[PDB]
Design a protein around this ligand. Structure first.
Ligand SMILES: COCCS(=O)(=O)Nc1cc(-c2cc3c(c(OC[C@H]4CN(C5COC5)CCO4)c2)COC3)cnc1OC
Length: 863
């Protein structure tokens, strides 16, 4: 009642769109989605409210494990009990399970409190101090990201013994409140007129139209007559396509493009021929067009919401029957496709078929063999499904039904095959559903790794109520970390009108399933809102006065009650495990770059040294490419680690949150190469030669025996970053966008240009880094060639996963990133990974590239 109303207003402020606007559309598809998804999400909320206490830890604090541990040494740990002022430090082994550490902690408590305890270690979980992170399960301590991280930095793990009753009180606190195949006539539409058309009066107006099944044409494109340029052009002409109404596939889309001719692009618009209830569309349609930047089949199938300014093409869909006509039900489809001729071929053609199914464009005769032998593709080459789907004639209902019959008894495919099938090249809904079925086996860790791409896929969907939305919602409601990033990936695109309805509707549905998480995300939004206002202040102030003056005023503004309250005690949007507790106003500042990004520091007494975390708030730039590049660098690190190779990478968080707005994770104890190379006097790193500065800095940060492992960290990370930047074509690399951690770890920042952006980016070897790798010596081939080996190993591991990078980048094309919009961009990846060559041919080629980069480094070594 009063709560229903509050939650509704809270969801509205959270998603950045009033719920009343969904009702105002009076759209039955929108109303059905809201009803269906609200129900689906409320069932997940009820399922969760009754979860066991370990299951509720699996939901809220999913395990953060080392990639090499998915599916021996002395260790010092500090353990306290919940709300106890006293802790206990004790030696454990890296091979010990959390349970042994717990039994240890419980025996200590029994002896200090002089009483034999009722408690068993099974009734407890271990929280990482001041973090929404927990250690539980039968995994050795070294398998946990937190422990493993503490071991490299030499830090002592700090853990809190949390009872099951405490966890069950968290679960209770966070509770939700109380017949077409008959119609043989050619496809046709009436092109009535246009409205609000703005163009050069010297020219004429033409409407190009085409029927598509994804990006493939179903027939040849057709064009209207040339009508004189005016605000309201009138055609009233029938456009006739070469394709029977019975041949129209379920996912057929009618695409329009309006242009001015003497070409000159003005606008475009698409629509689905069948609705969400499978009915073949009849009557008049007003298409509110999107301004063009020749047809756009990949474009959205919903009209431009800016009705007041947008051009509108009025069309008529004919009543080809006196009663409604729905697309045949699956039972009628299987009944038609059931009957086929099983292909029988020679042993010679059997080797030729094997050759092409294991080989990727084909010749016509090669496509006919695949289609002839489709039954054998199902039985002996099921991973060749995508190649089979590409030869299927989508403009012939008899061929489509035969394809669908084989697909409905097709064995589930590996995750890598299923990711390829979500591409827009496979637009059929049954293929789409099959691809989601083979993706249900994804682990939460795999799903997390590919979520950004699966959210981009939502922009290729033709209808709101889809298998991918239910799958993303179900997985979001089952894992709080998936939930968090699903929300932010959707929320960050609400300023984009083509997606605002889809995205707003999914977030509302999500909020229905988690009232508590909605309130938690609102706290995140309240902090971001304040940051925007604070950053606006800084942008204006930085142009009018000195930096000490702007920094002081920034501080006074932060010191206001409203600011101190909104900016404190929130989960980080960059990582929900990270708690941003007390903002340290004195340690906050801003950068000197164009957008004057804010540098916000936090502290947490409960987390200790681990609670000292920073975020960078940046407003003015599109942060989506930075996020993608960094996610690709993190994926590389995961693949390398799975082959036992740790190149000591720094894939720091980067998250868009709003319109040209986002956060970047601060890596503390790091400085740019440019700052270190300044070679300021009265510093511990002051050098005799500028080439010594970076090694002297490493020396002051790592005294005595520590220097040796810092040079190794630098070498390892340098090899990984040399490989990452080359493979991804990261260019415009200089001293101010390369950083170094005190540990020796090198890392890259500011990924605004990738995939060659257009020039093939050569491999880069910088003399200042070769100097450190060589331990400051002129000649140190032992050290240098050990670095080349790290580079080669890293490169050949990525190649073996080349299809994964290709599949994920192809899915990203949906995002609309200016540097990832066609085949030219994916070609850079195919080239840089040398995927068309053998491992020997590719490795030899990488060596030609690495050697060319060494001779280039020698042009600076000569001086
Ligand atoms: C278009 O200009 C690109 C640069 S930007 O700043 O505008 N934006 C940006 C910043 C960062 C990034 C990330 C990290 C760090 C970092 O350091 C920059 C300073 C910070 N300095 C301390 C002294 O007070 C602040 C020390 C010297 O380096 C920067 C450190 O850990 C992670 C990444 N990407 C960016 O954009 C996409």
């Amino acid at each position: 009642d009063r709560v229903k109303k509050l939650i509704n207003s809270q969801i509205s402020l959270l998603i950045g769109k009033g719920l009343h606007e969904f009702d105002s559309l009076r759209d039955p598809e929108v109303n059905d989605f809201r009803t269906k998804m609200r129900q689906f999400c409320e069932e997940a909320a009820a399922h969760r409210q009754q979860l066991g206490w370990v299951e509720w830890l699996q939901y809220s604090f999913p395990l953060q494990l080392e990639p090499s541990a998915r599916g021996n040494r002395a260790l010092l740990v500090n353990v306290k009990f919940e709300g106890s002022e006293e802790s206990f430090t004790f030696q454990v082994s890296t091979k010990d399970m959390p349970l042994a550490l717990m039994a240890c902690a419980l025996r200590k408590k029994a002896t200090v409190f002089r009483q034999p305890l009722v408690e068993q270690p099974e009734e407890y979980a271990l929280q990482v101090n001041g973090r929404h992170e927990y250690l539980y399960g039968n995994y050795p301590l070294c398998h946990f990201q937190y422990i493993c991280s503490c071991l490299h930095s030499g830090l002592t793990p700090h853990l809190t013994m949390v009872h099951s009753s405490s966890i069950l009180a968290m679960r209770d606190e966070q509770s939700n409140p109380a017949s077409l195949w008959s119609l043989e006539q050619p496809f046709s539409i009436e092109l009535i007129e246009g409205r609000k058309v703005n163009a050069d009066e010297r020219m004429k107006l033409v409407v190009q139209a085409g029927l598509f099944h994804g990006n493939e044409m179903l027939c040849k494109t057709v064009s209207s007559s040339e009508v004189n340029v005016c605000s309201e052009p009138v055609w009233k002409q029938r456009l006739e396509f070469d394709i029977s109404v019975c041949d129209l596939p379920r996912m057929a889309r009618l695409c329009f493009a309006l242009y001015a001719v003497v070409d000159c692009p003005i606008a475009w618009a698409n629509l689905m021929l069948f609705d969400y209830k499978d009915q073949l569309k009849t009557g008049e349609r007003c298409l509110y067009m999107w301004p063009s930047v020749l047809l756009n089949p990949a474009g959205t199938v919903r009209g431009n919401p800016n009705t007041e300014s947008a051009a509108a093409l009025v069309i008529y869909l004919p009543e080809v029957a006196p009663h409604p006509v729905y697309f045949p039900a699956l039972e009628k489809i299987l009944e038609l496709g059931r009957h086929g001729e099983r292909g029988r071929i020679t042993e010679e053609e059997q080797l030729q078929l094997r050759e092409i199914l294991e080989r990727g464009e084909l010749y016509e005769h090669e496509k006919d063999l695949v289609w002839k032998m489709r039954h054998e593709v199902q039985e002996h080459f099921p991973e060749a499904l995508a190649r089979l789907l590409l030869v299927t004639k989508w403009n012939k209902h008899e061929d489509v039904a035969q394809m669908l019959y084989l697909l409905c008894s097709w064995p589930e495919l590996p995750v890598l095959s299923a990711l390829e099938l979500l591409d827009f090249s496979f637009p059929d809904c049954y293929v789409g559903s099959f691809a989601i079925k083979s993706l249900r086996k994804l682990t939460d860790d795999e799903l997390f790794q590919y979520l950004l791409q699966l959210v981009q896929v939502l922009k290729y969907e033709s209808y709101l109520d889809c298998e991918l939305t239910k799958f993303l919602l179900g997985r979001a409601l089952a894992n709080r970390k998936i939930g968090h990033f699903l929300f932010w990936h959707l929320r960050s695109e609400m300023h984009v009108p083509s997606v605002a309805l889809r995205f707003g509707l999914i977030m509302e549905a999500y909020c229905r399933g988690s009232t508590h998480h909605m309130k938690v995300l609102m706290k995140q939004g309240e902090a971001l809102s304040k940051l925007k206002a604070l950053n606006d202040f800084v942008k204006v102030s930085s142009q009018k006065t000195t930096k000490p003056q702007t920094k002081e005023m920034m501080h006074m503004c932060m010191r206001q009650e409203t600011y101190m309250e909104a900016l404190s005690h929130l989960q980080s949007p960059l990582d929900p495990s990270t708690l941003l507790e007390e903002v340290c106003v004195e340690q906050c500042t801003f950068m000197d770059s164009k957008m004057k990004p804010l540098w916000i520091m936090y502290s947490s007494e409960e987390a200790g040294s681990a609670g000292n975390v920073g975020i960078i708030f940046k407003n003015g730039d599109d942060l989506r490419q930075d996020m993608l590049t960094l996610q690709m660098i993190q994926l590389m690190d995961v693949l390398w680690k799975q082959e036992g190779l740790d190149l000591r990478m720094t894939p720091y968080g980067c998250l868009p949150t709003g319109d040209r707005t986002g956060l970047i994770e601060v890596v503390l104890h790091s400085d740019t190469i440019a700052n270190i190379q300044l070679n300021k006097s009265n510093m511990a790193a002051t050098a005799a030669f500028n080439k010594d500065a970076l090694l002297n800095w490493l020396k002051s940060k790592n005294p005595g025996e520590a220097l040796d492992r810092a040079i190794e960290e630098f070498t390892l990370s340098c090899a990984g970053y040399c490989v990452a930047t080359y493979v991804l074509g990261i260019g415009d690399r200089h001293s101010d966008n390369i950083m170094i951690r005190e540990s020796g770890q090198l890392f890259h920042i500011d990924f605004g240009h990738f995939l060659g952006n257009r020039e093939r980016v050569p491999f880069i070897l910088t003399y200042d880094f070769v100097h450190v790798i060589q331990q400051g010596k002129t000649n140190n081939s032992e050290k240098f060639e050990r670095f080349r080996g790290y580079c080669e190993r890293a490169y050949t591991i990525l190649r073996r996963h080349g299809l994964l990078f290709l599949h994920l980048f192809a899915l990203m094309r949906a995002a609309g990133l200016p540097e990832l919009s066609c085949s030219k961009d994916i070609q850079y990846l195919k080239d840089s990974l040398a995927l068309g060559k053998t491992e020997e041919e590719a490795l030899k080629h990488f060596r030609v590239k690495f050697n060319e980069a060494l001779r280039e480094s020698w042009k600076t070594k000569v001086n």
